[PDB]
Design a protein around this ligand. Structure first.
Ligand SMILES: *CCC(=O)c1nc(C#N)ccc1N1CCCOCC1
Length: 451
């Protein structure tokens, strides 16, 4: 019978700060998405995901021991003997990628990297590990980060984020102007991000009462990560599924009935109010299928002062295998105050190589911003394949560069998934540089396929 290539895979993301302690004997609940929150129904337990990505922090095991525990747990659940795709460890921060044996011919171009984020490196043990690879014609990226601890240190966590984003080297190195937040069709970023609930310590019993009544709304409105995301300080244009599970930190170990939030010598005389430290976020190219099917925490794995967190995703993928991409009325708006002239660069695997535009025309925006107008002067891109079943599924990455310095001042992405061809249609992408919002790009596009 026919052997189609998949257009959709399911991905499991797990993040667990193990608190430097060996795991219990049974951790199957983690991979089954069993516990609290948006959980997975019993009926699906025997259905294996295509890829399992496991991030740990404060992991005390050797790679061989953890790999053993993980494969046994997955065999218990699925019968399948998963292949190791990659495993990479920095200090006690670790990422494991496992995949169905039937996908081993579909996965290629595997890379790993890590970034240390310390004020004295050798002093702190924080940072990130990552893995990227191609699944057929889709690029995938995964980042597991352990950010700075402490309720008062949200600015340091934001800096950690920004440094991992800028310096982690994954994916297609030909995408020179782009950092990991634009190099992948799907990017998953997870870990002990260490953001806390910002409420007074003397409120701790009130917080616990709310957790016991499962009213998280008031607590989540004080979550540092959601606040900093809303204020565009971190994780620009990422998504996160609604949190519907209790805070995953800080628990008394060996039970799940006590939040150990008070100060004591072991914690440096610091409070650890209940917090959603452990998180999974994602960022996918526009108009690519991605749906979160579970996001929650386990209840029965109690060896750490964190509970494990799980999330699962359906993610759209593509495979192997005149045309013209025209831009009209295009312009960028930039927060910059540089007086340089700016040009555009277009990158895409539908192109034989990236295309460089001529410089735009500068003018002062209404609100005192810089407006760079390109008009109908932009190059007409000639894709290597004209079939609309292929071209409509592609994306064009855009970098706006200084002609004085050749550095990018902003990066974004445009989907070719259009409602019409040979027709002018509006396009838009925000622009970020080094992970911060720097402007916007808008205009019209006209796509020609073979029809
Ligand atoms: C090490 C990165 C790598 O092998 C790679 N990864 C992706 C993704 N996702 C796509 C392409 C590539 N290669 C190898 C190195 C980068 O430049 C050429 C393409």
């Amino acid at each position: 019978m026919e052997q189609p290539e998949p257009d959709m895979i399911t991905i499991f993301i797990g993040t667990w700060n193990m608190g430097n302690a060996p795991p219990p004997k049974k951790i199957t609940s983690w991979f089954l998405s069993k516990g609290q929150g948006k959980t997975r129904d019993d009926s699906a337990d025997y259905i294996p995901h295509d890829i399992y990505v496991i991030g740990t922090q404060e992991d005390p095991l050797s790679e061989k021991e953890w790999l053993e525990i993980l494969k046994h747990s997955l065999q218990e659940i699925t019968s399948v003997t998963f292949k190791t795709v990659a495993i990479h460890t920095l200090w006690n921060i670790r990422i494991v990628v496992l995949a169905k044996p039937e996908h081993e011919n579909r996965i290629s171009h595997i890379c790993t990297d890590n970034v240390k984020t310390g004020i004295a490196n050798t002093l702190g043990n924080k940072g990130a590990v990552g893995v990227s690879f191609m699944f057929n014609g889709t690029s995938l990226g995964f980042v597991n980060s352990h950010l700075t601890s402490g309720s008062e240190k949200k600015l340091r966590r934001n800096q950690n984020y920004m440094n991992i984003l800028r310096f982690l080297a994954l994916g297609d190195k030909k995408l020179s102007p782009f950092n990991i937040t634009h190099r992948f069709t799907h990017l998953f970023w997870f870990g002990d991000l260490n953001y806390r609930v910002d409420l007074p310590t003397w409120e701790a019993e009130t917080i616990i009462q709310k957790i016991k009544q499962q009213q998280y709304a008031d607590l989540l409105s004080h979550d540092q990560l959601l606040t900093e995301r809303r204020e565009q300080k971190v994780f620009l244009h990422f998504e996160e599924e609604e949190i519907t599970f209790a805070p995953t930190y800080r628990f008394e170990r060996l039970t799940r009935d006590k939040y150990a939030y008070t100060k004591q010598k072991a914690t440096g005389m610091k409070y650890n109010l209940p917090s959603w430290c452990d998180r999974v976020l994602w960022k996918s190219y526009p108009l690519v299928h991605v749906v979160c099917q579970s996001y929650g925490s386990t209840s029965d794995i109690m060896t750490s002062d964190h509970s494990p967190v799980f999330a699962t995703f359906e993610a759209g993928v593509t495979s192997q295998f005149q045309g013209q991409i025209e831009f009209l009325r295009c312009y960028a708006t930039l927060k910059t105050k540089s007086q340089t002239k700016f040009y555009l660069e277009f990158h895409s695997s539908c192109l034989e190589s990236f295309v460089k535009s001529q410089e735009g025309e500068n003018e002062e925006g209404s609100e005192g911003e810089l407006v760079v107008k390109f008009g109908e002067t932009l190059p007409k891109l000639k894709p290597i394949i004209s079939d609309p079943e292929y071209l409509l599924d592609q994306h064009i990455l855009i970098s706006i560069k200084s002609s004085d310095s050749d550095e990018s001042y902003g990066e974004g992405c445009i989907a070719l998934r259009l409602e019409a061809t040979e027709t002018q249609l509006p396009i838009y992408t925000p622009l970020t540089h080094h992970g911060e919002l720097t402007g916007h790009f808008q205009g019209e596009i006209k796509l020609q396929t073979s029809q």
